[PDB]
């Protein structure tokens, strides 16, 4: 992450929510619209000559029918805007063109969580143009809920707080409501239906029932749902009250408020202003609880013995993977696996040091591992020297000698592996471009020669020919600058980074060399890490049983793998 994307995403999304396993899709959402926000950060985003929203506005007006027997062709744009102003008065002159003083742009990002109160079809209420700033049930001729309904199998904790600032013990009924909607008559008559989990304000008694004292003139009340064990709780003035409900997993909810015509409120969902309850201090407690519950011949593992041509019959047993620290199998498997990873790619000196050190540590099962490990480190000795030489050549920036070496050792590889020689020649060209700082009369000739080699030969397939052109245009766009590592944009300058060249040519070339000789190219360690990260997501996707029955805590919803486990 750069030094601007972090700031922008922090300004956009709520703080407590970026620390959940649901920060990944939020980062994807932001990443889909990076350049546009980068440009727009100049002005006109702090609290008309349509071009392509023309057809969408036209369709959305003809849906109502205020346009009759009038052709799509020959329509005055200003007429459409004028008529649109009559039925969408709050249009903030930005949709036509199509802490955080940013107006409602989350419609573009597709932010899938509630953000504002939505207005009922009647006029028995009025909200101050945002759904947040000021809600008041205007004089009669009052219930409402949030716009979107939060899902259940995609997050862990949700929390929003309202501030009451007008009185008729106040008379507001707030909380959550189960959603089967766009049951309301009784909601408008009383303060709650049979499916409204709410905290009243007349006396404080929870709905559907001595819970807590009533709130009054200026009070801040927050409504939090916890999906780890299925609970709903309420807080007032930053002091956590008791948990109000229990056993509510696998449902769907929406924020809900019923208000008497004498009281007014100001809501907050955490987008702009921070809370007072310190929800982070509540979330880390459950994270620590989950970590406490989870983490408190023979060694070599082969293929799984349950696979028959895509059929997985499951022997009826307690559990499949019985590896325990007390037995000692886990360190054995970890040691053999770590040595395999080390000798897979260079670092043979470190592997020899490891063999020496766990030869020294043992005192008179823990020697079969040493013997097998020594055999493994001494058998594959020819590939390790080639790998080390390749690493030296790539790190020295001598890619032409690298091609000479690859062709020299393995005879029959380059002649029929064009998709690798392209990735090597392009890197050689990039090295030349980076070094050149009057060779500019030769860069052009080199680029034209290799373009004519890799584009206009037509013996290559069509998709490959089309792909070899995008990379060439991208690398060509570098020449227009004079110090491309600083002046150029993020991506094009990304081509010149140490990462790309040095940590990608080797990654491609090593795996190519291994897979050409009919050997597996998986280290079985990053395989383990990726499998764990995918298993956590596939458990989160399907609401799962915690220990015995689906009424206990579900602890896999608190294991945020990357930021909490993979970074020291």
């Amino acid at each position: 992450m750069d030094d601007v994307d972090r700031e922008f995403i922090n300004c956009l999304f709520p703080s407590y929510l970026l620390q959940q396993p649901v920060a990944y899709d939020l980062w994807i959402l932001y990443l889909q619209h990076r350049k546009l926000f980068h440009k727009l950060k100049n002005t006109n985003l702090i609290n008309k000559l349509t071009a392509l929203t023309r057809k969408e506005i036209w369709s959305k007006l003809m849906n109502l029918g205020v346009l009759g027997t009038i052709s799509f062709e020959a329509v005055n744009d200003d007429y459409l805007i004028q008529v649109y102003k009559y039925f969408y008065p709050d249009v903030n002159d930005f949709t036509l063109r199509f802490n955080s003083m940013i107006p409602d742009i989350y419609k573009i990002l597709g932010y899938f969580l509630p953000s504002r109160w939505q207005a009922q079809p009647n006029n028995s209420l009025q909200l101050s143009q945002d759904g947040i700033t000021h809600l008041q049930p205007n004089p009669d001729y009052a219930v409402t809920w949030a716009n979107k309904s939060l899902p259940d199998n995609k997050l862990t904790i949700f929390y929003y707080e309202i501030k009451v600032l007008s009185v008729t013990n106040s008379n507001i009924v707030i909380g959550y409501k189960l959603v089967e909607n766009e049951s309301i008559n009784k909601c408008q008559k009383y303060g709650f239906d049979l499916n409204v989990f709410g905290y009243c304000g007349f006396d404080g008694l929870i709905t559907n029932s001595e819970y807590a004292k009533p709130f009054g003139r200026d009070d801040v009340i927050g409504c939090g749902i916890n999906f780890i064990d299925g609970s709903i709780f309420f807080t007032k003035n930053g002091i956590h009250l008791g948990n109000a409900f229990t056993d509510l997993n696998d449902l769907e909810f929406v924020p809900y408020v019923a208000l008497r015509p004498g009281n007014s409120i100001k809501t907050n969902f955490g987008l702009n202003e921070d809370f007072v309850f310190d929800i982070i201090g509540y979330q880390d407690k459950w994270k620590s609880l989950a970590y406490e519950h989870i983490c408190r011949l023979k060694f070599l593992l082969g293929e799984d013995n349950r696979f028959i041509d895509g059929k997985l019959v499951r022997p009826d047993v307690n559990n499949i993977n019985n590896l325990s620290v007390d037995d000692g199998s886990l360190p054995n498997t970890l040691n053999v696996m770590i040595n395999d990873y080390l000798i897979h790619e260079g670092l043979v000196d470190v592997a020899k040091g490891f063999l020496k050190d766990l030869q020294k540590d043992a005192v008179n099962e823990s020697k079969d591992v040493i013997r097998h490990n020594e055999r493994q480190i001494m058998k594959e000795e020819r590939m390790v020297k080639i790998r080390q030489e390749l690493r030296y050549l790539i790190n020295k920036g001598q890619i032409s000698k690298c091609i000479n070496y690859i062709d020299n050792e393995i005879p029959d590889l380059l002649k029929n592996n064009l998709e690798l020689v392209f990735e090597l020649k392009l890197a050689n060209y990039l090295v030349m471009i980076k070094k050149s700082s009057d060779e500019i009369e030769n860069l052009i000739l080199k680029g034209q020669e290799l373009s004519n080699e890799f584009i206009y030969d037509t013996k290559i397939p069509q998709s490959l020919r089309d792909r070899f052109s995008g990379q060439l245009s991208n690398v060509s766009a570098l020449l227009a600058y004079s110090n491309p590592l600083v002046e150029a944009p993020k991506e094009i300058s990304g081509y010149l980074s140490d990462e790309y060249l040095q940590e990608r040519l080797f990654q491609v070339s090593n795996n190519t060399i291994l897979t050409f000789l009919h050997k597996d190219s998986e280290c079985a360690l990053e395989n383990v890490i990726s499998n764990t990260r995918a298993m956590l997501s596939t458990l989160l996707e399907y609401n799962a049983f915690g220990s015995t029955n689906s009424s206990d805590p579900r602890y896999y919803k608190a294991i945020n793998f990357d930021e909490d486990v993979l970074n020291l």
Binding site: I444, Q448, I455
Partner: protein
């Protein structure tokens, strides 16, 4: 003169006489800035284009520059353009004070854009070694950066197609560099530049190219807008008459009602679904009887009839509810079947040998939900699009690239639907509905063009179609009247009454002027146009 302006009339006449090719008349009837700039461009001596020969143009939208910036911009061929860029650079340091009424910048942006266009032409003229890079880098990256700054400092740019223009321009210019073939395949003569520059100028000072022809075509359109039965398609007049609708032949063949009618794609046979086929070029003598059926089709060769029965599978003459054949000679002989069972399998006239059955078959997405349950199908004449009805009031359009599967669009209408009636040989479609309306959709861009009103249609099934080329649109009704709308404008041209509901209407795709109507009174009538 009349009510126009005499000077405007004279200027238009002079430019028209020049444009026709004549010289002496225009050059004698006389008894500039844009002109001299255009001459400079046309002959080509760009090294003479100083700032004030550009700033003197009468910009289309706003007023000229304030008489303070032009002073710094008029302090006095690589060196010439470098000098111009150097002169421009100081104006930015002067305007850093940010004192502008959102319009001075709105003019400086236009001027910078014109200058960048001229420089782009200069650059592209180098391909018809190490000179293009030295030119591009400085003498264009600096202009592009300045233009981007000016564009950004406005509350006017459309987020969609106005905000990435400098970036895409510079990217294209830089990628042309190590790929010269695209420069050759570019069509970069010295007149498209003049076209764009003229697009930047005031249109009431530079007479637009070919205006009198435009106004004459408009006047012909006005005249055509009086009578809608004509052949003219863009001196004294072409209107002021009257026309009429006359029925002349009736068929009281039986007493049962009529469900469906169809005319041969060559105008030589009339099908009926009471199955009977009538000769039509021989004074309507019954040709044959073929042996319930509720849909008819003819082969594009106009040889083989295809029925579409109720419970039996299919029948062909020398569940399934609709069938439409292709048109392309490459894939001719192939046709598409429908079914109210969520199934659509391409097929042919070999009574066997099925093909792609789509009951489960710049970006792509994963498979969606199921149960299409097609009702009526249509095939685009270029055979490149397949249109399917549903029962939940939506239409699907599928793309067929080549057999010897995605969906381009899903058109939503709401209310229940009926016949589709693809236009007769842009993209159009005429969906009939309940709720007493007709809609003229557009399946290529997924937008509703217009609506037609006035035909009773509730809890039954009625038919509509095109007629008189693609100029008239007619429909049946619950009351036994035929309704006939103008298509371009959308007003009720005629309401005939010849049945006592009327179900089906059809036309020759061979004769411009006649059609046929059948109803539930047990009758078939033929109508024609009198003058």
């Amino acid at each position: 003169v009349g009510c126009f302006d005499k000077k405007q009339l004279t200027k238009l006449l002079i430019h028209t006489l020049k444009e026709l090719g004549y010289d002496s008349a225009a050059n004698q009837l006389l008894l500039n800035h844009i002109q001299t700039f255009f001459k400079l461009i046309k002959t080509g001596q760009f090294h003479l284009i100083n700032w004030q020969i550009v700033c003197s143009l009468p910009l289309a939208h706003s007023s000229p520059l304030r008489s303070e910036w032009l002073q710094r911009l008029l302090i006095p061929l690589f060196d010439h353009m470098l000098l111009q860029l150097q002169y421009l650079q100081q104006l930015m340091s002067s305007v850093n004070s940010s004192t502008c009424s959102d319009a001075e910048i709105a003019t400086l942006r236009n001027y910078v854009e014109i200058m960048i266009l001229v420089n782009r032409q200069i650059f592209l003229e180098f391909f018809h070694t190490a000179l293009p890079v030295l030119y591009l880098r400085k003498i264009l990256k600096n202009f592009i950066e300045i233009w981007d700054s000016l564009l950004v400092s406005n509350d006017q740019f459309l987020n969609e197609e106005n905000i990435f223009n400098p970036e895409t321009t510079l990217r294209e210019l830089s990628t042309y560099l190590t790929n010269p073939k695209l420069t050759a395949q570019l069509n970069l003569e010295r007149d498209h530049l003049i076209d764009a520059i003229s697009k930047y100028i005031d249109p009431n000072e530079l007479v637009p190219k070919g205006r009198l022809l435009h106004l004459l075509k408009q006047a012909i359109k006005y005249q055509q807008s009086q009578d809608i039965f004509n052949i003219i398609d863009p001196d004294n007049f072409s209107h002021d008459l009257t026309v009429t609708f006359q029925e002349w032949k009736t068929i009281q063949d039986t007493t049962d009602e009529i469900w469906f009618l169809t005319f041969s794609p060559n105008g030589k046979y009339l099908a009926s679904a009471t199955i009977t086929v009538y000769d039509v070029e021989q004074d309507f003598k019954i040709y044959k009887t073929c042996v319930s059926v509720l849909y008819l089709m003819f082969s594009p060769d106009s040889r083989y009839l295809v029925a579409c029965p109720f419970s039996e599978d299919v029948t062909i003459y020398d569940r399934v509810w609709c069938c439409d054949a292709f048109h392309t000679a490459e894939r001719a002989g192939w046709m598409v079947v429908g079914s109210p069972d969520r199934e659509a399998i391409v097929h042919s006239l070999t009574t066997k040998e099925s093909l792609f059955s789509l009951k489960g078959r710049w970006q792509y997405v994963e498979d969606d939900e199921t149960f299409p349950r097609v009702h009526d199908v249509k095939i685009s004449y270029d055979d490149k699009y397949v249109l399917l009805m549903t029962h939940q009031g939506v239409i699907d359009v599928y793309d067929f690239s080549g057999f010897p599967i995605p969906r381009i669009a899903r058109l939503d209408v709401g209310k229940n639907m009926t016949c589709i009636s693809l236009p007769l040989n842009q993209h159009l479609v005429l969906v009939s509905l309940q709720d007493n309306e007709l809609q003229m959709w557009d399946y290529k861009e997924n937008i509703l063009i217009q609506k037609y009103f006035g035909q009773k249609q509730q809890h039954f099934i009625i038919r509509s179609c095109f007629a008189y080329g693609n100029k008239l649109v007619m429909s049946g009704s619950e009351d036994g009247k035929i309704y006939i709308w103008d298509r371009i404008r959308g007003n009720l041209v005629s309401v005939l009454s010849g049945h006592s509901n009327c179900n089906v209407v059809a036309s020759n795709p061979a004769d411009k002027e006649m059609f046929a109507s059948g109803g539930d009174d047990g009758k078939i009538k033929i109508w024609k146009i009198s003058r």
